[PDB]
From a paper:
The GLIC is a pentameric 174 kDa (1585 amino acid) membrane protein, characterized by a large extracellular domain that surpasses in size the water channel diameter of most LCPs. The ultra-swollen mesophases were successfully used for the crystallization of a membrane protein, GLIC, with large ECDs otherwise inaccessible to the conventional in meso crystallization method.
GLIC was thus purified in a low-salt/low-detergent buffer that would not disrupt the swollen mesophase during protein reconstitution. Crystallization trials were then setup using three distinct lipidic systems containing 5, 8 and 10 wt% DSPG, yielding highly swollen Pn3m, Ia3d, and Ia3d/Lɑ phases prior to the addition of the crystallization buffer. The obtained resolution of 6 Å is modest, but typical for first hits of membrane protein crystallization trials. More importantly, in-depth structural analysis revealed that the in meso grown GLIC crystals crystallized in a completely different and unreported space group for this protein, exhibiting a tighter packing arrangement, with less solvent content (56.3% solvent content) compared to loose crystals grown via vapor diffusion techniques (typically 76.7% solvent content). Moreover, the structure obtained from in meso grown crystals shows the GLIC molecules to be in a closed state (see Structure solution and refinement in the Methods section and Supplementary Figure 3), in spite of the presence of H3O+ions at the crystallization pH of 4, which normally stabilize the open state of the channel, as found in the vast majority of reported GLIC structures. The crystals were found to be organized in a different space group compared to crystals of the same protein grown by vapor diffusion, with the noteworthy additional features of tighter packing of the protein and the stabilization of its closed state as opposed to the more conventional open state found in loose crystals obtained by vapor diffusion.
Residue numbers in the entry:
A (entry chain E), B (entry chain D), C (entry chain C), D (entry chain B), E (entry chain A): 5 to 315
Write the structure that this text describes.
Amino acid sequence: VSPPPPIADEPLTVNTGIYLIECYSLDDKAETFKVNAFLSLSWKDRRLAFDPVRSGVRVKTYEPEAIWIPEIRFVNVENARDADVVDISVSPDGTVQYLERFSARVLSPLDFRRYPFDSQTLHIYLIVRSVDTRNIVLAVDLEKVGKNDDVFLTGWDIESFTAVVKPANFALEDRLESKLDYQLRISRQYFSYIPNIILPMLFILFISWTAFWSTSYEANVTLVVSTLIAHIAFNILVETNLPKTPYMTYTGAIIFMIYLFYFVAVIEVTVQHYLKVESQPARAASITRASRIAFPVVFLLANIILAFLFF
Amino acid sequence: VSPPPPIADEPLTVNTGIYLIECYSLDDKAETFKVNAFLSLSWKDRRLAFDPVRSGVRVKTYEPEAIWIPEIRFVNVENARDADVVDISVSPDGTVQYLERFSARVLSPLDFRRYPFDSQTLHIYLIVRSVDTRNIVLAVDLEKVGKNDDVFLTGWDIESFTAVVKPANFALEDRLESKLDYQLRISRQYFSYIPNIILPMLFILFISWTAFWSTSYEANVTLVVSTLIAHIAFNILVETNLPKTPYMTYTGAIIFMIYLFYFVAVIEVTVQHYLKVESQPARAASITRASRIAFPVVFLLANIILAFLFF
Amino acid sequence: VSPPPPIADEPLTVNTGIYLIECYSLDDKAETFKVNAFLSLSWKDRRLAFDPVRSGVRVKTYEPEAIWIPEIRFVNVENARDADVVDISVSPDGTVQYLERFSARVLSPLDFRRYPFDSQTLHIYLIVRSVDTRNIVLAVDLEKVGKNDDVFLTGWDIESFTAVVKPANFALEDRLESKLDYQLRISRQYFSYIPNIILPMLFILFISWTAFWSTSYEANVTLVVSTLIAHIAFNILVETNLPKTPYMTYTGAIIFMIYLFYFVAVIEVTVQHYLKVESQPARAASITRASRIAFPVVFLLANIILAFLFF
Amino acid sequence: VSPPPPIADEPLTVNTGIYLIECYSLDDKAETFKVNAFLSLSWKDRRLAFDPVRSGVRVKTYEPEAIWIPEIRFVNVENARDADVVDISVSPDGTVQYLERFSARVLSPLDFRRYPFDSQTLHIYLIVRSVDTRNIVLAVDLEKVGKNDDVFLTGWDIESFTAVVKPANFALEDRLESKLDYQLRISRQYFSYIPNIILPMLFILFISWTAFWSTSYEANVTLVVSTLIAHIAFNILVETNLPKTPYMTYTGAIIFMIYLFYFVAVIEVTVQHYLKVESQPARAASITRASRIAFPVVFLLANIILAFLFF
Amino acid sequence: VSPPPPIADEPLTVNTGIYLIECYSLDDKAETFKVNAFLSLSWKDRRLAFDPVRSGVRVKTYEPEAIWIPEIRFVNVENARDADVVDISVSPDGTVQYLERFSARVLSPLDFRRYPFDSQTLHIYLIVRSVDTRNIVLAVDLEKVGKNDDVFLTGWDIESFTAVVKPANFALEDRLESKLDYQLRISRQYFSYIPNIILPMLFILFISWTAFWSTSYEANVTLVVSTLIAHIAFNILVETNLPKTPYMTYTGAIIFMIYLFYFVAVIEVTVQHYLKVESQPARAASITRASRIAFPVVFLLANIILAFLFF
């Protein structure tokens, strides 16, 4: 019921820990992710200390209403964290060990520039409100911070679950207090995105490049334009995988460059035809012969420039 | 338990403030957006005033049930806001400082005409119901209205968070009262919409225009019609980004104009062929040669007209 | 707590009113729509009447549990409405003024035959269960039925919000009682549907009709078949706007007719080619020349027939 | 309160009835359907019998808590039904008449083989748990089973609402008891599925068959392959209507056969070309001339065979 | 009330059982599934034992509050299950028989590698928290574990509902306890996936292979490229069925191989044309003639390699 009284001006330290059981629903559209984990809280309350002789046992189990529990909340969540309390154990010195199982949709922005090689830092912000009697400060108990052997992260590599040990206070409210940040560093796995996205998109463009080894303007127009259609269609096919970003992404820049190369390939084919029809087939043949190397070289070069710009 | 009594006929002033922590799920289809913010309320209640010497402390903390709190509600929300109280502090003169954290889906119409340069005014309407003893009026505390330094609005520029200082009363109910409006002026960022939507859609049309530099009717039909298909496919590709509006938008007018240009390009190619087959190749060559300039010129001109009409 | 006793056998009249604040989620698939509105109830209870001098105030505010409130329910809703009470005010004569804010998904069938010119009648059925002590009858207070100046209905014209003043009793239950119907007559806005749906779909078909002014079978096959593809693609593009109806709609009949015209156009092109190859170019030329008028004429005629059949 | 005592060993008979008011959300994907209906329960309790002379009235109205009500539940629901009680009336002999309004998602498998002519049997399984004091058995009161005149079933014909009078006991639990089944036999309406799905899909294939009346290999390749594309596109267009079934459906078999016919048509066109180029234009002409009849004939036969196999 | 006291140090055994009534919402995207089942709990409480002679009846029915009930929770659920209790019966020896109906979204990872032949193990983890007075251990009662005769799993074969008899303790919390696992082994049905996905996808590729029996470079380019488009379109058509996996799946590898074969087929056609134009038609004819066998052989071989690698 009542908060524990402070022996001195020192604030009450609440040790926190999150044991990630499962992470489901990775909505790349809303930049939200659902989490199911264990939340552990540890704090010393002299009020519940006892002697083990007269009490008999070494541990005392209470119900959430029977004792005082700090109001711990999550900052970046869609709605209040659904709470299922598991156990409350008090040690002889009065140290309370709280454990609850929770599940909540977390708001965590994602940077899609480096996609599909991008690395992300998922954040889970813990916060506590200090009362008039008593101030409450949060701490991280590394022994209660962990991820299970059955942690499944399909498509990502879990780099580090290391929570922010020094989490700066958010000056939003009138009274500033330290909000314990939980940084989960992950890196995207890409073994599929090449054979499923990049490679076939390169194949269609290379097919368009066969117009440099032909003289029939009709066949060349069919090649370039029909391949352009195939490219659009393929983009429609993979649209789900690609991200709808208001900023420029690496992938998006490659796509744009491919569109430019289709335009230039059209220009080339048209010029070659015009020169042949205007009775100068020597120039037409020279341009086409040059394009056979120029296009792949310029493409590979611009890809190195792009890669350099983004990485 | 009871409303504060007025010393004179003057109404009770409730100072309001909203500190926007995070804005997620910006559904352009339903024209709704989810918000997570702090709501602060400030009002003077003489009933809770005290002397700080005999009471000892300078501030007095109460629970929501213990004291009277004005019934503040949001007008344009899908459903009732999340009700999580953070703190209630009473100063020696009796001034109550209320703070709560809420999360709610806000209903706010969006004008998509100027898209993708469109600017929007997001509205958050605050309202209070006046009691029999004393009427209650709302006010804006500019010191408690703010956005954090890390608030990032992906895809938008935040122009002004300036809430309506003079919010007209909504004559909806039987008793009219001032409803405090919160205008958030934002402007769309477009650094991506050109390379991802406009530019490739211009490329496909320009490809269709190469039929003016060819004489093979077969190749020209393939160029124009196949490019038309590529255009439809590309629209399907970007369909998600484009808005389903029941009124005419700037983008939609450009799209329609592109469809018209494909039709006219077909007409040209057909006429050229007919004149050649109908033994007048001088006219055919003159029309095609003219079209080489006419089409781009007329396009850029009509585009300037469109821009002028919408801006 | 207890129902007001009737002074005579007359039933208790509950005056109702619905103030539609916002209407979101217009599901064309389920024929359901979500509504957010104010519900006002007014009825006279002598038990709560008082004198304003000895009582001091002119209005008396109660809590929902403190007094009797009629059990008002909605018939055509997915589930029970959102129950958020706003205010309860009692006038000196005992007249109770109840106000609540609700949000619920309403079930209302939609007729898509006349689409996209279709007019609809949205229904909201109010119902009350009469108790043994005194029967309760519903009435409409036209002064409390209204829509705000900020009422947004994007794409529709609100014809009449006139609720059914004489709503017949539904003989479903064992005891029949009058259920207050709320008819919202609306008519679809089409300022976009011509330039966004009809016109480009007509353009593609007309492009297919250019095969009648050409003799090259290859170019004609490309024109007709490729335009047919463009037609399918365009339908996919506009798919969201068109309705998935199990009955035949006007738009759907037009679409089917367009498919038929593509088939016939194929037949024509094939016949013309066969006659030319089978050494009778006079007949081929006569058929093609006739088709140049026959196709548009028959189309416009059948279009007039369709319009007549549906309107 | 307590259950009514049996005069003899006979079980308590609870007469049931369901009045289907509206049926919304027909998810053919999840094979679930939402229902909103009235549930009526009737049973004789001597404990509540009275004389109408000393009591004055002929009917006695109670509240659900005041008297005993059997625990009736639904078997095939996603989650527990909506519980809104309408009326409880007791006759002088003690016969209780219970009426409640409910809304619940019913889980009911659908057989899509005969689609789009398929007939379905929707099931609603009622169940009651027998207590130690007296066993409870369910019965069907045909007078309380009905569907309103405003029952709307868009796209289906309601064959019979006849609930299972002899519903076999589910040996699921340890104690087997009869579970009252409610069979709703419906048949699909198809006046739209032919002009919207079948007919245009036949048109595209017939267009592919025009390659048998031409000798230009280029035009034939364009015809067959481009029509194949048009076929895929049309399937994408109607994809929503067609079902994603893990077993073989009639429609799915037709679709597969059409794909085979496109493959064979390709073979024919290629062979014809090869024979002509390999200086045997005689074989090519005989095969093509035969195919002109063979393809439609074989198609119609295989179509009758399919119909016979499925019906 | 209070937990039952142990006669000796042995822990309290709670026998569990889950009777799966219905399984809806099989989200292959989120790898979650919704379940509706009965949960039965059985445990002996000496405190409630009675003699059936003095009490009269053989069974005693209690309310959940009246007696002690173990706190059973699910590990891998989105949120706490729906809690609707059905019955609580106590036998004369004191053995309590608890039955509740629940509905909850279960988190279960799915392995899509072997798709569409893949087999899955759905997991439902039961857990109980031991109190200070007496430790509680869970057990599985197979007589209360079952699935109804009307259990519907459209598209899957239910192999075994056998729960983990020896479920290892999860060392997540501070105090390790055995968590009863419920393994539901299922295998995917594929009688449709061949005629609906594989077969037509093979048909289009085989159509591309007809370019090896033709010499017209124009027709071959049309064949290969247009079939490539048809392939992309078909993937778009079936996109819903295929899984968006971040790892390499068997199906995904087949798809990639098909894309490679389209690229190689393009190369072949181009080489053949180049050799013919460069005045060496003997080599061109030899390559084409070889490809006619090489392509199917290499395809079938690599397909056998893939099957072997995944199975």
